Structure formats: C-alpha cells, structure tokens
Subunit: 157 residues, 3 copies
C-alpha cells in the first residue's frame, strides 16, 4: 500500500535546523520540500542528571518519527557538513570547539588535557581541591592572590 511506503520513508529523515525555541526546547527543521513543526531534540541526559546544549540554525540533524497514535518526531544532532566541518582528525581525542573559539580537548596520544581560548574559569568546592603532579607552572601576567589563613611551603625556595 502506497502510504505504508510514505510512512516508512518519512520514519527517518535528515535535514537542517531553521529555527530554535530555547524556552520550549524545540526546533523547526527543513527536510525535503517542507519544514517541520516545533520538535523536541534529544539531549545526552534528561533524568537525575540533565544536559543542555542547544542545536543551532544551520546544523544538520536526523529526524525520527515515532508514528502511531502519538505520531510525534524528535531531532537528533549532529552531522558534519561543509558549513560545519569536523574540528579535528584525531584518532582518539575528544575535541570540543565552542563558537567563541574556546577548545576543550583530551588527546590520549600525548595524554594531554587542553582547555584554551576562554576568559573566566571558576571552581567552587565545599571541601577539597587537590593536585598531584611533579611539575606545576603558573604564569600570571598580573598577579596570583592567595586569600587564606595559611600557606605551608613544605621545603625550600
């Protein structure tokens, strides 16, 4: 029958985000000769842990229709394109490129953890922050301020 085939071909589609609604957490997607209604996108976690990282206009995605009584569809980022190419060719590295030019990266080849291209950086811990490593370098252009009752240097200078 002719629409079982229509339902099957529309079950999984690919397309481009054309509009986002950050409050609703929904987007509209151009796929084939139409633009979808407002669809939710899948995120990494939406349970006891919750992630948020909104897809952007121009981002290529899959659209998965559930069909049935419900008949909703969901958006799943993301697919590399000419406009949005892979930011790396590394065999094993996790590489994250933010639109401000910042990079978060771990490269298992050199075992190098890299954060760069940012302005601010804050860690607020209630108990302990420790660091255990042969060499530590701080290159402060302005000054390092040590707001504490106490600093123990263990040996020499």
């Amino acid at each position: 029958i002719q629409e079982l085939a229509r339902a099957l071909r529309n079950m999984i589609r690919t397309g481009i985000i054309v509009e986002t609604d950050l409050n609703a957490g929904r987007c509209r997607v151009q796929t084939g000769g139409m633009c979808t209604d407002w669809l939710q996108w899948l995120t990494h976690r939406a349970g006891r842990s919750r992630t948020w990282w909104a897809p952007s206009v121009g981002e290529q995605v899959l659209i998965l229709a559930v069909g049935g009584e419900l008949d909703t569809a969901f958006v799943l980022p993301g697919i590399y394109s000419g406009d949005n190419p892979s930011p790396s060719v590394s065999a094993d590295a996790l590489h994250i490129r933010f639109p401000d030019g910042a990079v978060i990266e771990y490269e298992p080849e050199t075992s190098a953890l890299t954060v760069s291209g940012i302005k601010t950086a804050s860690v607020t811990a209630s108990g302990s922050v420790t660091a255990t490593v042969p060499v530590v370098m701080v290159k402060a252009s302005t000054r390092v301020t040590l707001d504490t009752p106490e600093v123990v240097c263990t040996n020499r200078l």
Copy 2:
C-alpha cells in the same frame, strides 16, 4: 499487510525508564500499553574510549527496534519532560546538572567555564600541569598546602 504496519509503528517508540540494571547495563521501559524486556541503552562511546552515564527511572527515551532475525531494541536518552525539564535556556552553553546539585558549564557568551556545587576535586598527572592567565585567585577558608621540594616566586610580594 496488517503487521508490516505493526512492525513499522513499533520501529521507533518513546517511553519512560521504569527499571535499571547497572551490572548488565540494561533497562526496562514503559511504552504504550507494555513494558519492554531488558534493553541495552546507547552510550556516547563504547570503543577505544568508553563512556558510562546510566539513564534513570523516570527518564523519557526513544526505543529503536532493529527487527529482522535479531529483533532486539535499544534505548536512547533523553527527552525533556515536566518531571525533567531543561536546566538552561542558554543559546550556546553546554550545561550539565548533576543530582547532587553540582554544575559543569561553559558559556561561550561570557567565555566562562564553571564548575560548582562539588565537594572533592582531584587531578593526578604524571608530568605537567600548567596554567597561563593574567589573574589567579585562591580563596582558601582553611589553608593551602604546597607539598613540594621547591616553589619559585618569580618577582615580588
């Protein structure tokens, strides 16, 4: 035929996690008028790099059936709900909210990297940990301990 249509509608479904098996890495999901058998969930990576971040009871997910000789199905988190709403409305930020209230976040708008709401924090490196930035502030309520043969302050006090 009437079950091609049944297979098609059951190919992609949405539902809610009702039980987890952390040892097996499987979950059961309520979808429509039934609860699935124990299904594996998809994770970010399961190769040379491996991720683990178990979905939780109450989390809304997609279920994707492979059909065929195999006929298995897999669970894919996650979809925002009333119980589990988006933890942010930020246009570009990666925002992670843990159930202990901790937040990991980078906001490209302010280029601010944020870790907060945690107790402990440990970095164990075999070689070098360096930090290159104009201003550095440490606000230790108790004390900072510098267990090293040597600390070079490069200029003044």
Copy 3:
C-alpha cells in the same frame, strides 16, 4: 510487498565498525552478511559548537537508513559489548575512560570530580582563573613555579 519488508528491516540495524576514515569522517560497518559503504557518523554537536570523538574499529553501533530519494545511512555509537564493556556500574556518575588509561569522572554520590592518568594539562585563559574552597593541596614532586609580578599571601605561614 516483499521489499517494503526488506526496506523496513534494513531501516535500523546494528553492527561493528570495521574501518574508519578520519579525514572524511566516515566509517564502514559490518552488519549482517555485508559491509556498508563509507557512512558518516553522528556526533554530539555539529553547529555553532562542534564535537569530534571518532568511533573505533571494533565498536558496536546502530545504522539508521533515511531511505527515499537520498537513501543514505548514518552511524550512531555506541553499544557495550564483551570486547568493550561498561567502565563503571555507578548509579549517577559520568565516567569517561580513554585508551591511554586516563579517566574523567564526576561521582554525584561523593560529589567527587576526578581527573587522573594523564601526562599534561593546560589551561590558557585571557582573564581570570579563580578557585574557592576551604582546603587546597598541591603535591609537586619536582617544583611549583610561580611566574608572576606578584603573589599576595593574605595572612600567615
């Protein structure tokens, strides 16, 4: 009809990565009695933010065919296997295991943020890096170097 059923069963498949092309960002996958052509894989983000974390040979994945005029298919990691088992059983923790043995982990149970098993670690910020916590420990086997015009210890020693 006999190939609506063939299209339906081939719509969603599972298989194993047998070859990768890091430049093209494509992989070939063994599924059933065949190996696919070069298929793109889905990544976390491919928009204003862009992620890269290539799947590896031996990694079990889903393959999603879009059918239709396009008829392409996309690869979605990842599924735990005997070769690539879950690196954790933790109820709430995000756990990342790199092939160099490094671990990135937050465990909400103990509220402990863990980075370990790495060699290098660099943060390059243009403005501020601050840290706000009762206890701070640095255990430098070799030396800590403070390349700054100024360090203010706020009280005592």
